[PDB]
Amino acid sequence: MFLNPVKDSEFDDEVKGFVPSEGEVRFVANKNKECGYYLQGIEQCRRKMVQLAGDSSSQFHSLGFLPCKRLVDAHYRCMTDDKFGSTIEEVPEIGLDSAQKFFDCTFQQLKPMQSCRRFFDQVVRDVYRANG
Amino acid sequence: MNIAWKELENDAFKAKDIAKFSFSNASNLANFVAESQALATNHFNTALNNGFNVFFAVAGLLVVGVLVYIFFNSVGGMIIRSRIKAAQPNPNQVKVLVMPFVALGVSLVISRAGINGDDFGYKG
Amino acid sequence: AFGGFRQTDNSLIIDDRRKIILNTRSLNDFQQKIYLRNFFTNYRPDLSSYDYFAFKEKLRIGELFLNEYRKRINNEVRRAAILTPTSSLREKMNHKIADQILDLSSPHVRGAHFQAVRSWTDASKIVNYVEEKQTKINKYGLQFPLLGNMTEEQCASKEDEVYQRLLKEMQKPPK
Amino acid sequence: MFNLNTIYLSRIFIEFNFYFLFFLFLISSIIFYFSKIISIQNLNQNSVFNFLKLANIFGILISFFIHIISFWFYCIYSYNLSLNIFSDINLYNSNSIELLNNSLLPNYFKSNITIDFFGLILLTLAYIVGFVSILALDTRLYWKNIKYIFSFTIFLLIVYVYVTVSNILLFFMCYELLLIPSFLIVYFVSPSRRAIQASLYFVIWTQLGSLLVLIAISYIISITNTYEFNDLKYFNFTNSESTIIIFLIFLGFGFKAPIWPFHYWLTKTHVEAPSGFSIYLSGFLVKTALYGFYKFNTSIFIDIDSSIFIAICIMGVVDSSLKMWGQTDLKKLVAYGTIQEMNIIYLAFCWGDSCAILGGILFSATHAFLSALMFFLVDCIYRRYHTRSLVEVNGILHITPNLGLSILFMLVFFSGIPGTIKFISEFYIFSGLLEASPFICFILMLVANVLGLIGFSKSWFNATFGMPKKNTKYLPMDLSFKESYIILYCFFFLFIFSYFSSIFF
Amino acid sequence: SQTFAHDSFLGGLNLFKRRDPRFVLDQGERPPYPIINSNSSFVDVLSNFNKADFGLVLFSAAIGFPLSRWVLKGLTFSSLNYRRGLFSSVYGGVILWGLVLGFNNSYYRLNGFVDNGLVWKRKERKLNKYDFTSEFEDNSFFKKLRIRD
Amino acid sequence: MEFSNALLSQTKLPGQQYDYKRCFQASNTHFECLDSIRDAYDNHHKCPQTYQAWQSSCDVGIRRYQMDNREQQKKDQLLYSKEQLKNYNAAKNKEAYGITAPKNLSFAF
Amino acid sequence: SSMLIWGACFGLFTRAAACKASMIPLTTSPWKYPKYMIVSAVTFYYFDWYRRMALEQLCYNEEKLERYQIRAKLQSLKIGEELSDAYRESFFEHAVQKNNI
Amino acid sequence: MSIFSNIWINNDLNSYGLSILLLNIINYLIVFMLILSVILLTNLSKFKSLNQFKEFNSYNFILYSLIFSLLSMAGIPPLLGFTGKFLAILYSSFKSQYLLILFMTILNIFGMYFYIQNLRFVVKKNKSSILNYKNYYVNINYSITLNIILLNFFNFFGILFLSDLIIILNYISSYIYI
Numbered sequence A: 001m002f003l004n005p006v007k008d009s010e011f012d013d014e015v016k017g018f019v020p021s022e023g024e025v026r027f028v029a030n031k032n033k034e035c036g037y038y039l040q041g042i043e044q045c046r047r048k049m050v051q052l053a054g055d056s057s058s059q060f061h062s063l064g065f066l067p068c069k070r071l072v073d074a075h076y077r078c079m080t081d082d083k084f085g086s087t088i089e090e091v092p093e094i095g096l097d098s099a100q101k102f103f104d105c106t107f108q109q110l111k112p113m114q115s116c117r118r119f120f121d122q123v124v125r126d127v128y129r130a131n132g
Numbered sequence B: 001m002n003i004a005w006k007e008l009e010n011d012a013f014k015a016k017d018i019a020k021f022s023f024s025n026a027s028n029l030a031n032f033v034a035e036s037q038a039l040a041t042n043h044f045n046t047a048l049n050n051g052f053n054v055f056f057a058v059a060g061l062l063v064v065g066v067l068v069y070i071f072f073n074s075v076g077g078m079i080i081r082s083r084i085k086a087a088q089p090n091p092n093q094v095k096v097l098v099m100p101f102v103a104l105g106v107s108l109v110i111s112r113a114g115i116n117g118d119d120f121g122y123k124g
Numbered sequence C: 001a002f003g004g005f006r007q008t009d010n011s012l013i014i015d016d017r018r019k020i021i022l023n024t025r026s027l028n029d030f031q032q033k034i035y036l037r038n039f040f041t042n043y044r045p046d047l048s049s050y051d052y053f054a055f056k057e058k059l060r061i062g063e064l065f066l067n068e069y070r071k072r073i074n075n076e077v078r079r080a081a082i083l084t085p086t087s088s089l090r091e092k093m094n095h096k097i098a099d100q101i102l103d104l105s106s107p108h109v110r111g112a113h114f115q116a117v118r119s120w121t122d123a124s125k126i127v128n129y130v131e132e133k134q135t136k137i138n139k140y141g142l143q144f145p146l147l148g149n150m151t152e153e154q155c156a157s158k159e160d161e162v163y164q165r166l167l168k169e170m171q172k173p174p175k
Numbered sequence D: 001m002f003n004l005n006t007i008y009l010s011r012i013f014i015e016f017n018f019y020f021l022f023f024l025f026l027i028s029s030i031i032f033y034f035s036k037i038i039s040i041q042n043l044n045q046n047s048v049f050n051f052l053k054l055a056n057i058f059g060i061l062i063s064f065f066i067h068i069i070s071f072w073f074y075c076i077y078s079y080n081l082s083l084n085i086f087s088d089i090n091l092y093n094s095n096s097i098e099l100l101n102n103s104l105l106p107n108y109f110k111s112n113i114t115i116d117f118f119g120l121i122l123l124t125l126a127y128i129v130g131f132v133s134i135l136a137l138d139t140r141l142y143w144k145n146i147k148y149i150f151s152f153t154i155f156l157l158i159v160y161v162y163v164t165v166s167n168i169l170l171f172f173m174c175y176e177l178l179l180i181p182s183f184l185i186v187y188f189v190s191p192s193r194r195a196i197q198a199s200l201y202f203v204i205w206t207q208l209g210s211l212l213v214l215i216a217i218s219y220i221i222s223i224t225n226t227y228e229f230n231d232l233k234y235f236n237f238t239n240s241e242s243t244i245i246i247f248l249i250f251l252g253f254g255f256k257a258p259i260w261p262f263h264y265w266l267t268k269t270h271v272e273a274p275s276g277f278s279i280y281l282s283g284f285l286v287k288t289a290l291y292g293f294y295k296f297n298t299s300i301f302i303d304i305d306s307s308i309f310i311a312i313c314i315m316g317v318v319d320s321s322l323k324m325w326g327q328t329d330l331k332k333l334v335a336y337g338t339i340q341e342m343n344i345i346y347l348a349f350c351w352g353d354s355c356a357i358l359g360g361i362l363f364s365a366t367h368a369f370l371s372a373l374m375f376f377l378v379d380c381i382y383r384r385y386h387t388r389s390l391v392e393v394n395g396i397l398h399i400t401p402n403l404g405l406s407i408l409f410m411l412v413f414f415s416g417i418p419g420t421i422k423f424i425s426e427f428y429i430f431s432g433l434l435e436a437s438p439f440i441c442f443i444l445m446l447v448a449n450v451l452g453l454i455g456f457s458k459s460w461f462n463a464t465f466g467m468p469k470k471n472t473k474y475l476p477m478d479l480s481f482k483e484s485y486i487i488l489y490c491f492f493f494l495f496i497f498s499y500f501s502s503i504f505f
Numbered sequence E: 001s002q003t004f005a006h007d008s009f010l011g012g013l014n015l016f017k018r019r020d021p022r023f024v025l026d027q028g029e030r031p032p033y034p035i036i037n038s039n040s041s042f043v044d045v046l047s048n049f050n051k052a053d054f055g056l057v058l059f060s061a062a063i064g065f066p067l068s069r070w071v072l073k074g075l076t077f078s079s080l081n082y083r084r085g086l087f088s089s090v091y092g093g094v095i096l097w098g099l100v101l102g103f104n105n106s107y108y109r110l111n112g113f114v115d116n117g118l119v120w121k122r123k124e125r126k127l128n129k130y131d132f133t134s135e136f137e138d139n140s141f142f143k144k145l146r147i148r149d
Numbered sequence F: 001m002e003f004s005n006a007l008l009s010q011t012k013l014p015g016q017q018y019d020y021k022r023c024f025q026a027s028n029t030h031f032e033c034l035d036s037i038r039d040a041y042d043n044h045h046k047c048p049q050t051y052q053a054w055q056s057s058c059d060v061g062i063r064r065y066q067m068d069n070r071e072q073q074k075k076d077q078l079l080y081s082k083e084q085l086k087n088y089n090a091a092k093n094k095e096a097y098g099i100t101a102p103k104n105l106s107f108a109f
Numbered sequence G: 001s002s003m004l005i006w007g008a009c010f011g012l013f014t015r016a017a018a019c020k021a022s023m024i025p026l027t028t029s030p031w032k033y034p035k036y037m038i039v040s041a042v043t044f045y046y047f048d049w050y051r052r053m054a055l056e057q058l059c060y061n062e063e064k065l066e067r068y069q070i071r072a073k074l075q076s077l078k079i080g081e082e083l084s085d086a087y088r089e090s091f092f093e094h095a096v097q098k099n100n101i
Numbered sequence H: 001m002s003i004f005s006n007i008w009i010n011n012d013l014n015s016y017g018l019s020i021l022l023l024n025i026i027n028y029l030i031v032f033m034l035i036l037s038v039i040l041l042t043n044l045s046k047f048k049s050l051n052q053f054k055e056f057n058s059y060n061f062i063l064y065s066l067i068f069s070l071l072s073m074a075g076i077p078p079l080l081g082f083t084g085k086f087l088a089i090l091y092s093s094f095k096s097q098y099l100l101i102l103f104m105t106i107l108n109i110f111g112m113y114f115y116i117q118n119l120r121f122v123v124k125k126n127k128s129s130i131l132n133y134k135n136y137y138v139n140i141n142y143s144i145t146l147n148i149i150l151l152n153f154f155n156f157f158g159i160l161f162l163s164d165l166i167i168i169l170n171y172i173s174s175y176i177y178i
């Protein structure tokens, strides 16, 4: 999504569109092409982990989605060209809210892995807009 | 192969990370594994059964109607057909008129009921 | 697995990122993909397959929307012609209507042409306009039967949300 | 209020109509083969051929009826599907619906059925034109060649599989499968002696085009080891490969859909072929080239200028329309009209996936019905007067006036009165061409709608009017009910399809 | 799977039981059974003859009669003497083929290519990575023709 | 040809024969002297006498084939087990009865 | 579906087609009908086993063909490329590490 | 055939072409043997000149069997002779030889006309009567007829079972280097 809220609007939810720079589109497309392997693995890892300890009686039900975390790290590193951090927890202050949105939309709300890519891409876009 | 739960402990990871990597409640996990987050396998099976029945009814009624129409109106020239119909008893004429129309119209009515959603409960 | 075709032209390729030197005529299948097939073929390559499908549908609807704008202004001109005599029609039409007619002409509005020649930024702006209209009409629940498909359960929640929003807007002070 | 019921209705109807047709064909074939030893007509009142005839006719009609309902379902389905992705504005939700499989029949050729608007238009044209053509082949089928009563059901099955697959390999195979029945019909059913060489010409040109298409398909398959149209979204073709592919597919599909330099086979085949198969060939078969090209045109990114292809198509239109005056045979004149409008349709696909394809899609059906009507009129004249040459027959009016009235109304509809779909298609294509090329649009319009129209109208008016003085002892009777109803249905379809839903086109 | 016991009249049937469709093993590949005499001579194979090769010869003698009759069905313009001589020639040829098969079986047992009543001390572990035939054979007669499916 | 060790191993001098019994006995003894101590890379110097017997008993082509086969077996053992291989084969043969559908409107790429 | 039934169906239609092609009546020489189904059922049943067993050996063959392709590529390198940094490490692995014999 | 950190990955079989050649040879032999069985049913002395293809117009089995054999030889798509040429073009495109594709295309079109030219000569005024007589009656062979039935089945529907033949031929060809 590429709409920004309108401040001091007469009504509640009024938005205005914007177009990203050509560099941002190029960077996002190139990273998506070069790092789509991790993205597919997250979808497979997420489904596989529930298939093995979906019930609360399993021995490792407490761990949850922990191993897929590794994949979630790798993708992040790939999408950030290893220039910011080794884990998603080291994301700068900008894009931190979008990371929380991605985590909520990926695990707490087991949504189809179509909306979740939007939030990770939003993290990447925010980092790109902030830094250079 | 290396994505497993052996040698995994909550001691290494900090609580917040665990909080963002923990399973949801039982209902969400069940809907995820069953792939029933929006629609259920019962919905799907009922829809398949209804489609089967609708196709079979429509095809059977259409073929019956066209066969009876052809075999009732293909007996000869206009005068021969008029003589045959005049010789026919009243119930026979009534049948050979009505029932092809009944079959074809019922097929069309079933199709129209198929394309219209009138079961929606947000009326009033 | 994707493959490739053997190349013929002899030309040096300099990869400063990987710090290597290759030749176009000696590229294998993988090197051809990252050196010769890396160009973009979409308005928005940064979107996924689903996202670009939504973008393409929105762009088509936006072109139809601008065409509808032109049709509406034409019908307004016809109504003005019928309702207003020629003794004053030109001046009234010259007020605020002629400018709008010229605003929706051949380059701005595709009209009856095969294709609207737009850059990727123009397509993005048209899609953003359509999405702004959608967000305006969605928050009031105006698009249930005409431009949407909700279940019965979602209709009640939407009605409650719209009722609460309408109450909130009414009790605000005027600007 | 769109729900899952309509989705499953549409899918089930699509698959089950095919299985209905296939089971009809299998049962009729078994009855034909196992009833007698030789499988030729018994020439008596109780011949199996009678039954077979009815069966075939029956099935096509019934399948067509089912198809109509099926077609309607798809429309609604497609409409709502678009909506289901247009209104999904919330960033958290996404349309993720996964369907099940029917438990009664298997997926034919282990493939998932996918359908589009133009494919179903092609299927409808196949149904209607096949019905008309099989109705126009009763007298040709007799002792020792009755088997070819089965040809149109086979055509329907092949075209169904052609239009209901996302497999590019099965797509090409279904396109290739159409040649043997056509050659067999021309070889064994045509009464004219010159049809023996005409079938050879048909085969050799159509197979050269198929060879070009085969080279392009092998190129695509070998470079990208895949058979799905979807996977082509994730692979890029270089400039050289794209140019080679576009040239190969354009030339190969223009061999069948006759482009300017390759229509000798079409002229010979129409002049020598039986009337019913001529109806099928102009009405439907050539359209098979428009569909496939479109698919292969839309799945690949081409960075070439389409001026050469546009010029070739326009040269085809001009050359065909300039030759209409000097034709005395009516069937050859109808063939040249077919050539000009086929080239006009083929022009509309020279801009990629732009809005130019809608006019071409509509004008394909328009030409299908117009060509079917014109060839049926030529067949009626030939069976009445035993000739189809202007120097031998004229004054078709004043004796059998219904045929002359049909000729005049056909001329009106071909001229394109603004009430029909011919005018709509002309408006679409000419608006786009005028914006793309004003002088080209004017030249094409003047050459097609004036000079060719004048030649066509002269050759057809001279046959309708005059005094039939020569052989009054052998003058024929007027139209039968079958011919009258067929002509009326062609007119009705044109006029009423001028009222189709505007969501499409 | 289980193979027919050697040194018995049904041992020759083990010629029809195979583990893979290969004609021959690789140059350095170990034979399935321990080797008795790798570089055998002509009399070494003859001395290794036992009931299995004689059973092969007996089977050739049994099956040669219908085959010789079937060949003899093609004779015309013949006398009794020529017919009897030709039948004898065909039957003797079938006997010779049976003897050749017995010689090959004895040679195979000497080399260890077929079951010779010995087992390797160490089993060559094999991972059944690609498996298209296990369940098909277990639901069929072909489980008899396969060794260690 | 000209590149395969398999076809070169079949090339021999005139009057050259192989004693397969002795060679395989020595190879089995050497591989049982090994495989008791397990290493990622086989060290023959840890089994000197069996190594010498193996070198003096088997031809160079046979030894090359044996080392290639041993390397392949060691690579396969570290990755697969009998039970998971059986389960994977059963699952693949079970899904072979079904069809493959396109993944329309993907997300990954 | 079952291959045994498919073969039996194949033999039944083959005999009927042969009767039609020879212009002899059906119902003639009836004992050939069960014989054709039995022969055809066994024939296609064995072929089903053979095609499956050929896939297994073909897959195992490609593992050996995997090794041949790598060594063929290194031996087909143009002279001077063997010690080039693009292939130096891979070449040394086969020349040194694979000298384990 | 790429390398990543001294690990080689190849997606090419390297033995597909030999199997393709074997398939082409076998398919040609099958079609040739079909047409020669059709010839061997009949009286051999009648077929001397090319125009005497008309002699094959005797009864529906012989006529249609040879028409389809000729079409298969010409490379007509549905039949068996088309598959070998299609796979040859596919392998040539895989090996990136466009000049070879062009020359094979020229050869294929000229040979196709060379084959289908004889379909014109099959037209005959009356039935040919090309059968040998024995016991006062024509001698119609049943065994050759059944062989032609099987060959006709595999000519018409061989494209459905071509995968198994390709599997077997690639399995045989994989032994060439090993």
Ligand SMILES: CCCCCCCCCCCCCCCCCC(=O)OC[C@H](COP(=O)(O)OCCN)OC(=O)CCCCCCCCCCCCCCCCC
Residues within 6 Å of the ligand: E018, E021, E022, E023, E141, G004, G041, G042, G045, G046, H026, H030, H165, H168
């Ligand atoms: C009622 C049911 C009860 C239950 C079931 C009971 C079943 C019992 C009967 C079945 C079992 C009997 C024993 C086995 C069958 C007899 C042997 C046989 O047919 O062998 C086929 C042959 C084997 O060769 P293979 O094993 O590969 O040899 C290599 C090392 N052994 O394989 C080959 O020759 C290999 C393939 C050769 C090439 C084929 C491909 C190329 C040719 C294709 C087109 C052919 C066209 C015709 C050619 C001429 C031949 C007719």
